[PDB]
Every structure is written in structure tokens, then in C-alpha cells.
Amino acid sequence: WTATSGSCKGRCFELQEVGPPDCRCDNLCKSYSSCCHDFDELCLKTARGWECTKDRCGEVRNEENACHCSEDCLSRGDCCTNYQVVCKGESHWVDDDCEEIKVPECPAGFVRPPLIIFSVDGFRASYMKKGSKVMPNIEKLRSCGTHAPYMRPVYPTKTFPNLYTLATGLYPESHGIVGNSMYDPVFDASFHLRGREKFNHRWWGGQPLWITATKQGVRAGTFFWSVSIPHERRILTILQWLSLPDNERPSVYAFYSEQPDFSGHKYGPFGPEMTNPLREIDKTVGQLMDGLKQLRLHRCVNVIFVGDHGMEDVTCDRTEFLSNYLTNVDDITLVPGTLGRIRAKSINNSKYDPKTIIAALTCKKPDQHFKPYMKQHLPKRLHYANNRRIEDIHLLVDRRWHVARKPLDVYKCFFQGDHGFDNKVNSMQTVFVGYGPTFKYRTKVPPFENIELYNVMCDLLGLKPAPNNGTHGSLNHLLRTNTFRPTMPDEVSRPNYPGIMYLQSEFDLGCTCDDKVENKLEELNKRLHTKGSTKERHLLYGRPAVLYRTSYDILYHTDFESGYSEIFLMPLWTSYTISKQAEVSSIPEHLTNCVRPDVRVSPGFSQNCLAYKNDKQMSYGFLFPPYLSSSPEAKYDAFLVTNMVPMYPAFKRVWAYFQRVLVKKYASERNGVNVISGPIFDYNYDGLRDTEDEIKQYVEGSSIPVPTHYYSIITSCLDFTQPADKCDGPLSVSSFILPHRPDNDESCNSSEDESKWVEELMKMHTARVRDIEHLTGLDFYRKTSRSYSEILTLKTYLHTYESE
Ligand SMILES: *[C@@H]1O[C@H](CO)[C@@H](O[C@@H]2O[C@H](CO)[C@@H](O[C@@H]3O[C@H](CO[C@H]4O[C@H](CO)[C@@H](O)[C@H](O[C@H]5O[C@H](CO)[C@@H](O)[C@H](O)[C@@H]5O[C@H]5O[C@H](CO)[C@@H](O)[C@H](O)[C@@H]5O)[C@@H]4O)[C@@H](O)[C@H](O[C@H]4O[C@H](CO)[C@@H](O)[C@H](O)[C@@H]4O[C@H]4O[C@H](CO)[C@@H](O)[C@H](O)[C@@H]4O)[C@@H]3O)[C@H](O)[C@H]2NC(C)=O)[C@H](O)[C@H]1NC(C)=O
Ligand SMILES: Cc1nnn(Cc2cc(C(F)(F)F)ccc2CCC(=O)N2CCC(CC[S@@](=O)c3ncc(S(N)(=O)=O)s3)CC2)n1
Ligand SMILES: [Ca+2]
Ligand SMILES: [Ca+2]
Ligand SMILES: [Cl-]
Ligand SMILES: [K+]
Ligand code: NA
Ligand SMILES: [Zn+2]
Numbered sequence: 001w002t003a004t005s006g007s008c009k010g011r012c013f014e015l016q017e018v019g020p021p022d023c024r025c026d027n028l029c030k031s032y033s034s035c036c037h038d039f040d041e042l043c044l045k046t047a048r049g050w051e052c053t054k055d056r057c058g059e060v061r062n063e064e065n066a067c068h069c070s071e072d073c074l075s076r077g078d079c080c081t082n083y084q085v086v087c088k089g090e091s092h093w094v095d096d097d098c099e100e101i102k103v104p105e106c107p108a109g110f111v112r113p114p115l116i117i118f119s120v121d122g123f124r125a126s127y128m129k130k131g132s133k134v135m136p137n138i139e140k141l142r143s144c145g146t147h148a149p150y151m152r153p154v155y156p157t158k159t160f161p162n163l164y165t166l167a168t169g170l171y172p173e174s175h176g177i178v179g180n181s182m183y184d185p186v187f188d189a190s191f192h193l194r195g196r197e198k199f200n201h202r203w204w205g206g207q208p209l210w211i212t213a214t215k216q217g218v219r220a221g222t223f224f225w226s227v228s229i230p231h232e233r234r235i236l237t238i239l240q241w242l243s244l245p246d247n248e249r250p251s252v253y254a255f256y257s258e259q260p261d262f263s264g265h266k267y268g269p270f271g272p273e274m275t276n277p278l279r280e281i282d283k284t285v286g287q288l289m290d291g292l293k294q295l296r297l298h299r300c301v302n303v304i305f306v307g308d309h310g311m312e313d314v315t316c317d318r319t320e321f322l323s324n325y326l327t328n329v330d331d332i333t334l335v336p337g338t339l340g341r342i343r344a345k346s347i348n349n350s351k352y353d354p355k356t357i358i359a360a361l362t363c364k365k366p367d368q369h370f371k372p373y374m375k376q377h378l379p380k381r382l383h384y385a386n387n388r389r390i391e392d393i394h395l396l397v398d399r400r401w402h403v404a405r406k407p408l409d410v411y412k413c414f415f416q417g418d419h420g421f422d423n424k425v426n427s428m429q430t431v432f433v434g435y436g437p438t439f440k441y442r443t444k445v446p447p448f449e450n451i452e453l454y455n456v457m458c459d460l461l462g463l464k465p466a467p468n469n470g471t472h473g474s475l476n477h478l479l480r481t482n483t484f485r486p487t488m489p490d491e492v493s494r495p496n497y498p499g500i501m502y503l504q505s506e507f508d509l510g511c512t513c514d515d516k517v518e519n520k521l522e523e524l525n526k527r528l529h530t531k532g533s534t535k536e537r538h539l540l541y542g543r544p545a546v547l548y549r550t551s552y553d554i555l556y557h558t559d560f561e562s563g564y565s566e567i568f569l570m571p572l573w574t575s576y577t578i579s580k581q582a583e584v585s586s587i588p589e590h591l592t593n594c595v596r597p598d599v600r601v602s603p604g605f606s607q608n609c610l611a612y613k614n615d616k617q618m619s620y621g622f623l624f625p626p627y628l629s630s631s632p633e634a635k636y637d638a639f640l641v642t643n644m645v646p647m648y649p650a651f652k653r654v655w656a657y658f659q660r661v662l663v664k665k666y667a668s669e670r671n672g673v674n675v676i677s678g679p680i681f682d683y684n685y686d687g688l689r690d691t692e693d694e695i696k697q698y699v700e701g702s703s704i705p706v707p708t709h710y711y712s713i714i715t716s717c718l719d720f721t722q723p724a725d726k727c728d729g730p731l732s733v734s735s736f737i738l739p740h741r742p743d744n745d746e747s748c749n750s751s752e753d754e755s756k757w758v759e760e761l762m763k764m765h766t767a768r769v770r771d772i773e774h775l776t777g778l779d780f781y782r783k784t785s786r787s788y789s790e791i792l793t794l795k796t797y798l799h800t801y802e803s804e
């Protein structure tokens with residue numbers, strides 16, 4: 001209930017909201033059906049439009065006008081944004097040359113440069129180039145400020161998850177806004193775009209920037225705008241707030257445009273109808289910048305122009321129907337469209353089986369335009385699992401397609417655009433420009449992820465960020481000043497360096513190897529290798545630091561070095577360098593099933609071959625590949641029991657092709673590579689390293705835990721004219737986190753040779769180094785020549801494999 005008979009007089013776009021039944025005058029009151037009776041009359045004036053004209057200059061103030069051209073308007077803070085251009089001979093901001101903003105040039109009383117976030121819905125990254133002729137204000141912000149070629153959104157690439165990620169620095173799984181539509185089974189409640197459940201605070205986790213600011217004594221303008229407030233009025237409201245007294249004036253503001261998304265859905269991303277929305281957005285930027293210039297704020301404010309996601313060509317004829325695969329289609333609930341999420345229609349149906357739904361959806365049609373996953377099997381880079389609002393069964397839909405339950409859902413076309421697909425898809429990428437005293441001048445930065453921006457907005461305002469998924473410091477290169485200078489994390493566990501401590505006969509592991517094959521030149525030599533003489537070649541960036549409490553050993557070899565876990569009975573990491581000139585060899589026939597005890601590591605902290613023999617599902621692989629041994633004698637090291645890891649036969653196909661073919665391919669293409677590989681245990685799919693008590697599967701009969709995934713980090717010189725092991729400058733990296741699965745059901749062409757499917761699999765499971773850090777508790781690149789912030793940027797890089 002709302003007692004709508006209060007008044008909005010002197011309360012228009014008030015910044016503190018009032019409690020029901022008292023009526024509201026804030027920028028969300030329309031969205032709550034709570035505005036006072038006179039809110040339209042007083043707060044949404046439109047009389048005489050939005051621009052001063054020659055005949056209005058010096059007029060007598062008429063409070064009915066939408067904005068003013070009278071002499072007092074500047075000190076009142078309510079002039080039309082073009083007032084000084086029409087009435088005082090000034091130039092539009094867009095017509096002024098770019099001039100470096102070295103320091104904030106702010107009116108007295110400003111304690112910090114304000115931040116204005118200019119957010120645009122569905123603003124696809126390529127609009128910056130393809131629309132540049134019709135967006136002169138945006139183009140000047142871009143060329144004169146700091147810009148990225150694109151900014152990566154989060155998955156799903158929809159509005160609500162992405163705006164809230166922008167606001168919090170959190171993945172959707174952590175902030176809780178996992179879609180535009182959700183069912184929370186603990187609440188037993190549904191969140192939808194229409195309706196009122198979405199206003200309940202219980203959906204919205206983390207700490208968004210406006211709360212962060214308020215808690216630390218920095219005032220914030222309200223970020224949300226009811227859809228019927230026109231853009232001109234949003235801009236004028238911000239500019240009016242910027243004229244508040246010092247004690248009342250916010251330091252952080254957001255504008256939001258529903259365009260170009262709205263028109264994109266109707267017309268496709270490049271429909272000829274798209275030029276006009278782009279022009280109109282540009283005009284709105286121009287109104288802000290002119291208005292800031294009038295207030296002497298154009299060289300004071302930091303402005304961020306940022307999108308939530310892009311837009312793809314999608315029509316209703318490109319819909320896949322679950323009714324074509326499932327016999328039981330009425331026993332499921334589908335969240336449909338550019339992704340799918342499936343759960344049982346009724347929790348009383350004991351016949352509902354996810355395994356049989358997955359199987360009925362797996363590789364059933366030759367051109368099938370979606371792929372089912374149990375959520376824990378989705379690519380780890382999507383970080384899309386650890387939330388009860390994310391259904392166990394997921395469908396990753398191909399770009400340009402939809403999925404629906406039944407044909408009647410789609411005809412009971414309108415639309416030519418949509419979005420929501422995998423966040424590496426080129427059409428889903430969006431934009432970032434920063435312009436202001438605190439951003440760099442005329443500077444292009446590499447693409448980055450939108451989860452990073454919260455930290456930077458905090459830096460811009462002198463705020464300590466709440467705990468988030470950004471890597472704070474990774475975007476320091478965007479900033480002229482207010483950089484954040486973190487210290488590397490301290491190592492928690494120091495390694496042991498075991499020497500030869502065990503005789504061969506102390507091992508009863510059921511392993512065999514044909515290696516009784518016998519010199520002081522080459523005996524001193526092999527001793528030096530075991531003591532670390534080649535470690536500078538294979539460990540190029542220092543050993544990784546272990547950031548949690550555990551017991552592990554460093555093991556040196558000619559060809560590779562490893563950090564061996566006494567708790568998990570395998571390496572945490574294995575590091576090796578393969579030059580451009582390295583040669584690939586086969587496993588000799590006599591060594592095919594060779595596994596050799598490691599005389600540095602106790603039988604009690606070793607794996608055993610008998611467990612693998614007994615476990616009919618599980619085989620083994622090696623982390624340092626025998627194929628890349630530097631010599632026949634060095635090859636014996638590769639068969640140590642301490643280089644062995646549990647592998648499903650199905651996975652061995654993948655891993656063998658990576659090791660035998662791809663590593664050498666990358667070393668040829670990149671002029672040598674350094675490789676760090678290892679196991680990952682994430683049984684609770686939270687993106688973080690499991691403790692021992694979280695492990696759900698062991699090699700039958702043993703204490704050997706089975707990884708959920710295998711990683712590799714592949715580093716070389718960014719200047720590929722220099723070999724990876726003699727690189728003077730910046731590094732280049734690509735990484736993956738491969739799911740350790742007992743079948744290759746994910747890969748529909750897996751019956752073909754590995755050359756036709758393995759690399760496509762690996763591309764899908766591309767990863768950042770930081771993703772592997774979360775998953776292992778390890779900290780990489782500890783000893784380079786490079787600045788730490790540069791290394792943090794390196795750690796957030798994702799190799800996406802999309803074209804330009
Ligand atoms: C991305 O960045 C984020 C932010 O840094 C990372 O998320 C953090 O991860 C931590 C570990 O998973 C986690 O720490 C836990 O916090 C518990 C207190 O949590 C509440 O308070 C905080 C602080 O304000 C708040 O942020 C939390 O918000 C979550 O939950 C609400 C619902 O209340 C949601 O609205 C909100 O969206 C958010 O949800 C997300 O996180 C929760 C987990 O907290 C998930 O379940 C959701 O799916 C969603 O992803 C909470 O309101 C604290 O109680 C935990 O303590 C347990 O573990 C410790 C280990 O130190 C143990 O010693 C204790 O005994 C304790 O265990 C007891 O409870 C167990 C569970 O009931 C029980 O099994 C035991 O037997 C014990 O009784 C723990 O410290 C932190 O909350 C989140 N923060 C956020 C915002 O998500 C994230 O990891 C990053 N991602 C990556 C990939 O790096
Ligand atoms: C979510 C969310 N989380 N935090 N915020 C606040 C926020 C943060 C930022 C940030 F962080 F960048 F700084 C910027 C701007 C805002 C305000 C957005 C705003 O005023 N909105 C009201 C209108 C809504 C339209 C839905 S309908 O038009 C559609 N729904 C879904 C659609 S689609 N395109 O199909 O996915 S369109 C959007 C929100 N909003
Ligand atoms: Ca959007
Ligand atoms: Ca985990
Ligand atoms: Cl959704
Ligand atoms: K076996
Ligand atoms: Na297959
Ligand atoms: Zn949209």
C-alpha cells in the first residue's frame with residue numbers, strides 16, 4: 001500500500017528513498033508504482049524540449065520548462081546541455097581538440113574526481129569501428145582516452161548477470177544473478193524480468209559499488225532508472241546532482257541505456273535500422289559532455305563507457321526442439337533460448353533421471369546446435385556451477401541458435417537478434433572506454449574481462465574493494481595514477497628436497513620395468529641432474545609457490561622438475577621446457593609398461609601398479625611425456641612412479657595427442673615452450689582447490705585420488721624471434737583445464753582420429769592461469785624479470801581461438 005497523496009515538490013529524484021506507505025520521488029518510484037501524484041508534473045517536465053534556441057537565450061525563468069536558457073541556469077545547475085553553445089558562443093565538446101588531462105581540473109570543494117559510468121545495453125564490440133562515422137562523441141572518448149578493442153562479458157551473456165557482475169566484480173555463481181530467469185529451490189521462489197520477486201534483496205549477493213562507496217563514506221547517485229524516464233532527463237538529473245553542495249553531492253553515478261539492445265533484438269546486430277539508435281546514443285554522450293563542460297567538469301570527471309554484452313543474428317527458424325529428442329518432454333522444465341537449463345517438472349516424479357535425459361540429448365543429429373552438460377562438466381572458464389539456482393543439466397547453444405521445449409513455445413519472425421551464448425563468442429563481446437584525469441591518454445589496452453572493472457572503479461574512488469573475482473592490479477596499465485600495488489602472496493609450505501633414501505627392494509608396488517642396464521663421466525653427470533643442474537632450463541619462472549599447508553617434495557630430473565605431493569601421491573605441478581629443435585621419439589617396445597620406483601620417495605608415499613591393474617576402469621599417464629625425452633637414458637626418468645597420474649583410457653587419447661603431437665607443434669610455432677602440467681581436484685565444482693576430505697573417487701583399492709581435471713600452462717616469448725628459454729621481454733601464454741572424463745561423449749566426432757577432434761576439445765577448455773591458481777592453490781611466475789602488475793595481466797589472459 002502507497003499513500004500517494006504526499007507531494008514531490010523539491011524532492012524530484014531525491015537520493016534517499018522513503019519507506020511505504022510514504023510516497024516516493026526517486027528514480028525507481030515508477031518501477032514500484034509508488035511515485036507521488038505530482039511526480040510526472042514536477043519531475044518529468046518536457047515543455048519546450050531539450051535544447052536552447054537563439055530566441056530562448058536570456059529568457060525569464062519559467063519553471064515549467066524541461067531545462068533552462070535563462071541567465072541564472074548555470075548557478076541553478078539546470079541549463080539545457082547546449083545552453084553555452086547556443087547562448088554564449090561556446091563549442092560543443094566534440095568539436096574541441098583532445099588535450100591530455102594530466103591532473104584533475106575540478107571546482108573548489110571537490111574532494112575527488114567524480115566517476116560517471118555510462119552503460120549501454122547490447123553494445124557489441126564491433127560497433128566502435130563499424131559505427132564510428134555516426135558516433136563522433138563516442139569516437140572522441142575512445143581515441144583520446146583509454147580503450148580496449150573489446151571487453152569480455154560473463155556467461156550467460158545476458159543483461160542481469162552482466163550488469164550485476166559489472167557492479168560487484170563477482171561471477172554470477174557468486175553474486176547469485178545466474179540468469180534473467182531463475183528458480184531458487186531453498187526459497188521456493190522464481191525470479192523473472194517482469195514482476196516483483198526481482199526487487200527482493202535476497203536474490204542479490206555480494207557488495208555492489210554503490211554499497212561499497214556508501215559504507216566507506218563516498219556518496220552515490222542511484223544507478224537504476226525506470227524505463228519511462230527519458231535519456232535526456234537521466235542526463236539532466238546527473239548534471240543537477242553534480243551541482244549539489246559539497247556535503248550532499250555524490251562522487252559516483254551511473255547512466256543506463258536500454259539501446260542499442262532493444263533495437264538489436266528487433267533488427268539484428270547490423271540491421272539498417274541500427275544506425276539511428278547508435279546516432280541517438282552518441283547524441284546522449286554529447287549532451288553529457290557538453291553539460292559537464294558548462295559546469296567546468298569535463299577535465300575533472302572520469303567517464304567509463306561500458307557495455308553489458310553484444311548481439312548475434314538469431315531467428316526463430318534456428319530453433320532446436322527438445323520434443324525432437326526426448327520422449328518424456330512434459331516431465332521437464334526448460335529455461336529456454338540462447339542457453340538451456342533443465343530440471344524435473346515435479347520433485348515427486350521418482351522416474352525423472354538426468355542420466356537418461358543427457359544421453360537422449362547427446363550427439364543425436366549430425367548438425368546438432370546445442371550440447372548437453374552436467375554443470376560440473378561445463379568449461380571451467382565459464383565459472384557456471386556453484387549456485388543452487390543453476391540447474392544440474394545445462395545446454396550450451398551454438399551461436400545463432402535457440403533451444404526450446406516444443407514448437408508451440410516459439411509460435412504461441414518477431415526477432416532477428418539475441419545474446420546469452422558462451423562468453424568467448426565474438427558477437428557477444430562488448431566495449432570499454434575510460435576517459436578522464438585518472439585514465440591514460442590515447443592508450444589502447446588488451447581485451448580484458450568485465451569482472452576486473454569493480455576493482456578499478458574502487459581505485460578511481462579511493463575505495464577498498466569488497467572480496468571479488470577480479471585480480472587487483474591486473475588493470476593497472478589502464479591508469480595514470482591510483483594504481484594498486486599488491487605484493488605477491490607468501491608461500492605457505494616450503495618443499496623438501498629428498499635425496500636417495502630407499503633401496504629398490506623396499507618397494508612392493510607390483511610394478512615392473514626392463515631397466516637393469518649399467519662410468520664416472522656420465523655417473524657424476526646424472527647425479528648433478530638429480531641435484532638440479534638443468535633446473536634453470538625447465539623451471540624458467542621459478543618454482544610455483546604453494547599457498548596452503550601441505551607436505552611435498554621437489555624432484556629434479558634432466559628433462560623436468562616436479563613438486564610432488566606426499567598427500568595426493570602425485571605431482572601438484574610438473575615443469576619442462578621444449579625448444580624449437582626438440583625431437584619427438586616413441587616409447588621403446590621394451591619400456592611400454594615400464595613403471596620404476598623413485599628411490600627418493602618412500603613406498604608409503606608412492607602410487608602402486610597393482611591398484612591400476614585391479615581397477616578395470618582406470619589406467620595411467622605421465623605428466624612429463626616420455627615422447628619428449630632428451631635422450632634414451634633420460635627417458636627412464638619419465639617412467640618413474642612419481643611422474644604417473646591416473647587416467648581413464650578415454651582421456652589418455654586426448655592427453656597422448658596433446659603430449660605427442662601438440663606440444664612439439666607449439667614449440668615449433670612459438671620458438672620453444674615452457675610447459676607446466678598437473679592434476680586438479682574440484683569435486684564440489686566451486687572453482688577452488690579441494691582438500692583431501694572432498695575427494696569422491698580413488699583408484700580402486702588405494703589411496704590414489706582421481707583428478708577431476710588436468711591442466712597445462714604453456715608459456716613462451718611474446719617476441720617469438722627469441723627462444724622461450726632466452727626471452728628478454730614480455731611473455732605469451734595459453735592454458736587449458738581439460739575435464740578428466742571416462743568417455744569422450746562431449747566430442748561427437750571422437751570415433752575419428754585425434755587430429756579431427758582433440759584440439760577442438762582443448763580450445764573449448766581454454767583457461768586463464770588465474771583459473772588454475774584458484775583450482776590448485778599454486779602461484780606461478782614468481783621469478784621473472786617483469787613487473788608484478790604485468791604478470792597479473794598475463795595471469796588473467798584467455799586465449800580464445802576466435803578470429804579478429
Ligand atoms: C569469487 O570471489 C568470491 C568472493 O571472494 C568467492 O566467494 C567466497 O568464497 C568463500 C569460500 O567458498 C566463501 O567463504 C565462506 O563464507 C561463509 C559466510 O558466507 C556468508 O557471508 C558472506 C560475507 O558477507 C557472504 O558474502 C556470503 O554470501 C553468499 O551466500 C549468500 C546466501 O547467504 C548469497 O546471497 C551470496 O550470493 C553468496 O553466495 C555464494 O557463496 C556461497 C558460499 O558462501 C555459495 O554456497 C553460493 O552458491 C554462492 O556461490 C554468505 O552470506 C562461511 O560461513 C564459510 O565457512 C565455512 O567454511 C570454513 C572454512 O574457513 C569452515 O572452517 C567453517 O567451519 C564453515 O563451514 C561450516 O558451514 C559449512 C556449510 O554450511 C558446513 O558444511 C560445515 O560443516 C560448517 O558448519 C566460508 O568462509 C565466501 O562466502 C564467498 N563469497 C561470496 C560473495 O560468494 C569465490 O570463491 C570466488 N571464486 C573463485 C572461482 O575464485
Ligand atoms: C541488473 C543490475 N545489476 N546492477 N544494476 C544496476 C546498474 C549497474 C551498472 C554498472 F554496474 F555497470 F555500473 C550500470 C547500470 C545499472 C542500472 C541498470 C538499470 O537502470 N536497470 C533498470 C532497467 C533494467 C532493464 C531490464 S529489461 O530492459 C531487459 N532485461 C533483460 C534484457 S536482455 N537484453 O534480453 O538480457 S532487456 C536493467 C537494469 N542493474
Ligand atoms: Ca543487456
Ligand atoms: Ca573445490
Ligand atoms: Cl536466463
Ligand atoms: K586398469
Ligand atoms: Na564422442
Ligand atoms: Zn537483450
